[PDB]
């Protein structure tokens, strides 16, 4: 239909971002494909975006999956989502030095914890070892969250708009 011809709607974008993370991480977890997706919020991720390959791409579960396929140019690092775009892939993030992080967790988890210690980003990790999905926020790790738990956290942290009249002009950034 005609809606979408002239712009996009922030709450549609936010729910689509959540759905894209949920579907891609489920797809990857079932197949034991590791992944690392960091969603920028109020704290900028711009410097870490610059360390990766720029994509500036529309968000989809399909593109997120294709990025993380092992042994490919884009898989070795973080995807960073900024606004309504996959900004970069194969980005560096700071590694946490915390001795509280379990030694059985790998670089993706330590990078997710590291970025969470210095930004307000929300970061999602898929373990290649177990398929467990984890999330970091504010220096804390939520390990092996269920699909229901992941859904509730993503809604609370990434949706900032309630049920209201749709408009391409809402909450401009
Ligand atoms: C200082 C430093 O190394 N930072 C890193 N960030 C990320 C996102 C990394 C990563 C994920 S998966 C892989 N092979 N490497 S390493
Ligand atoms: Cl429109
Ligand atoms: Cl839209
Ligand atoms: Cl898909
Ligand atoms: Cl498809
Ligand atoms: Cl580092
Ligand atoms: Cl892993
Ligand atoms: Cl297994
Ligand atoms: Cl589950
Ligand atoms: Cl309008």
UniProtKB/Swiss-Prot annotation:
<keyword id="KW-0067">ATP-binding</keyword>
<protein>
    <recommendedName>
        <fullName>Diadenylate cyclase</fullName>
        <ecNumber>2.7.7.85</ecNumber>
    </recommendedName>
</protein>
<feature type="binding site">
    <location>
        <position position="93"/>
    </location>
    <ligand>
        <name>ATP</name>
    </ligand>
</feature>
<keyword id="KW-1133">Transmembrane helix</keyword>
<comment type="subunit">
    <text>Homodimer, required for active site formation.</text>
</comment>
<keyword id="KW-0808">Transferase</keyword>
<keyword id="KW-0472">Membrane</keyword>
<feature type="binding site">
    <location>
        <begin position="106"/>
        <end position="109"/>
    </location>
    <ligand>
        <name>ATP</name>
    </ligand>
</feature>
<feature type="domain" description="DAC">
    <location>
        <begin position="6"/>
        <end position="147"/>
    </location>
</feature>
<keyword id="KW-0548">Nucleotidyltransferase</keyword>
<keyword id="KW-1003">Cell membrane</keyword>
<feature type="binding site">
    <location>
        <begin position="127"/>
        <end position="129"/>
    </location>
    <ligand>
        <name>ATP</name>
    </ligand>
</feature>
<comment type="function">
    <text>Catalyzes the condensation of 2 ATP molecules into cyclic di-AMP (c-di-AMP). c-di-AMP is a signaling compound secreted into the host's cytosol where it triggers the cytosolic surveillance pathway (CSP), a host pathway of innate immunity characterized by expression of beta interferon (IFN-beta) and coregulated genes. Expression of truncated proteins (missing first 80 or 100 residues) in E.coli leads to c-di-AMP synthesis.</text>
</comment>
<comment type="similarity">
    <text>Belongs to the adenylate cyclase family. DacA/CdaA subfamily.</text>
</comment>
<dbReference type="GO" id="GO:0006171">
    <property type="term" value="P:cAMP biosynthetic process"/>
</dbReference>
<dbReference type="GO" id="GO:0005524">
    <property type="term" value="F:ATP binding"/>
</dbReference>
<dbReference type="GO" id="GO:0004016">
    <property type="term" value="F:adenylate cyclase activity"/>
</dbReference>
<keyword id="KW-0547">Nucleotide-binding</keyword>
<keyword id="KW-0812">Transmembrane</keyword>
<feature type="binding site">
    <location>
        <position position="76"/>
    </location>
    <ligand>
        <name>ATP</name>
    </ligand>
</feature>
<dbReference type="GO" id="GO:0106408">
    <property type="term" value="F:diadenylate cyclase activity"/>
</dbReference>
<dbReference type="GO" id="GO:0005886">
    <property type="term" value="C:plasma membrane"/>
</dbReference>
């Amino acid at each position: 239909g005609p809606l979408g011809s002239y712009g996009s709607r922030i709450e549609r974008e936010q729910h689509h971002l959540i759905e894209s993370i949920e579907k891609s991480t489920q797809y990857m977890a079932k197949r034991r494909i590791g992944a690392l997706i960091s969603v920028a919020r109020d704290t900028g991720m711009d410097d870490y975006i610059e360390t990766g390959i720029p994509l500036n791409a529309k968000i989809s579960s399909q593109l997120l999956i294709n990025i993380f396929i092992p042994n490919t140019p884009l898989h070795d690092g973080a995807v960073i989502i900024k606004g309504n775009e996959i900004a970069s892939a194969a980005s560096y993030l700071p590694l946490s030095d915390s001795p509280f992080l379990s030694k059985e967790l790998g670089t993706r988890h330590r990078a997710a914890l590291g970025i969470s210690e210095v930004t307000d980003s929300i970061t999602i990790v898929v373990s290649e070892e177990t398929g467990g999905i984890s999330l970091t926020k504010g220096g804390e790790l939520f390990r092996d969250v269920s699909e229901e738990e992941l859904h509730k956290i993503l809604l609370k942290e990434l949706v900032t708009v309630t049920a209201k009249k749709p408009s391409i002009f809402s909450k401009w950034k």
